[PDB]
Symmetry: C3
Subunit: 153 residues, 3 copies
């Protein structure tokens, strides 16, 4: 398996775990009680540090239930935990509900951490994609809604 | 190819497809008409269920055109569809424009689904990264803007 | 290494680089000065175009420091740069702070670009997961907070 070394900076919280076999992420706990008014964010400690392997990345994603039920999100989602980072994972929670505050208690599961390979790319500067001998593509320079699919596009 | 079994829970919608060869995602349709006032979210049915292979994850990402043109986003982006999930994919749309409502019609393309491998990690609890014999890293405990690049950091 | 061809559409900006060895992303610069009032977004040029290899995807993620310090986010995060795209990478910045405007200067590092493999899936339509001979799963149709972990779930 791909092992991930982890330090429970706050040993009072359980180790992050998958809710079900095959789940992509292990759920991260809040070390803290925090209450977010509408529109407010906080930087919340999870009580863990990890050593993402070289060649990989840790990614902090919101949980869907809280997202829908109370509008909880993460400002920098997907949080990007670098392989060299040995500090505490912190989660930038934000309340995107307009009216109802969100109360987080220490020990709630407030996000999930995935680990994936990542390509540590070597940039090759060219003067044009033609010089790199790249074939023309279907997409070309099309983006930002170029394929349609909604009246505003 | 990597096959993805899919059930069209709503057979009136086309199968999700890539807009162009090589595109990362297949676009998901809204099964529903929904109108989001500024700041409001909804949990929108896509009319599909999928079986992400074990060892992989499905990821629901916003489309860029709607993001810019009308401020449409996804509260839990990137939505994390687990390999064991066999329910309907639902998209937590949110209107991040301050003033203009977003109207979604059934059959609009409102998000995109990627599939990637994911490392199903085995946590190894250590008392310190030293005990794991890990070398010191350049980054160390630096994060949350430690490398600079903006006046607020 | 995985090479990524890049055109500096704006040669006055440095090539994107990793802040530290092993970091997942290369930081993207703003080509532009832009000032975002609370709640406003902009579509910001980065001054680069890239050729993500076929079979891969580029992903534009927010930086964590700006996310926490000033509430900067990205409407379509994680931005999905397709392998066929040869246009300029643009970043849909948004100010999620309620009260303080964010000022971006040309040359600030405003996001980071990761490159990952992606599964270009072949959809296989089935009438039920049973027909595909898929085993029942632990998770079943559970989602959107089914595993608990917060009082609102
Ligand atoms: O952050 C981003 C995301 C996308 N893009 C460009 C590159 C990408 O290949 C292209 C299309 O992205 P999406 O598919 O995510 N958006 P949308 O579906 O609205 O556009 P299109 O209809 O062209 O696919 O837009 C950016 O420049 N920055
Ligand atoms: O959700 C997150 C994201 C990042 N981090 C930590 C780990 C990561 O390696 C580190 C830097 O993340 P980013 O590169 O995404 N943010 P930024 O570029 O602002 O910080 P730095 O200048 O240190 O790279 O911050 C977290 O604790 N939680
Ligand atoms: O965008 C999404 C994200 C998740 N889902 C479904 C599929 C996924 O496997 C399931 C659980 O997703 P999360 O783990 O991200 N959310 P949460 O942890 O709140 O739910 P659960 O407690 O069931 O794991 O919800 C969607 O339909 N759309
Ligand atoms: Mg979950
Ligand atoms: Mg698209
Ligand atoms: Mg960084």
């Amino acid at each position: 398996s791909t092992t991930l070394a982890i330090v429970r900076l706050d040993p009072g919280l359980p180790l992050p775990s998958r809710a079900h076999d095959g789940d992509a992420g292990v759920d991260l706990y809040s070390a803290e009680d925090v209450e977010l008014a509408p529109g407010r964010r906080a930087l919340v400690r999870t009580g863990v540090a990890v050593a993402v392997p070289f060649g990989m990345v840790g990614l902090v994603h919101p949980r869907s239930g809280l997202a829908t039920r109370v509008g909880l999100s993460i400002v920098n989602s997907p949080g990007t935990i670098d392989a060299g980072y040995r500090g505490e994972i912190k989660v930038a929670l934000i309340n995107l509900d307009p009216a109802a505050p969100i109360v987080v208690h220490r020990g709630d599961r407030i996000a999930q951490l995935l680990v994936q390979r990542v390509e540590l790319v070597e940039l090759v500067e060219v003067s044009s994609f033609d010089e790199a001998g790249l074939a023309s593509t279907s997409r070309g320079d099309g983006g930002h809604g170029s394929s349609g699919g909604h009246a505003s596009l």
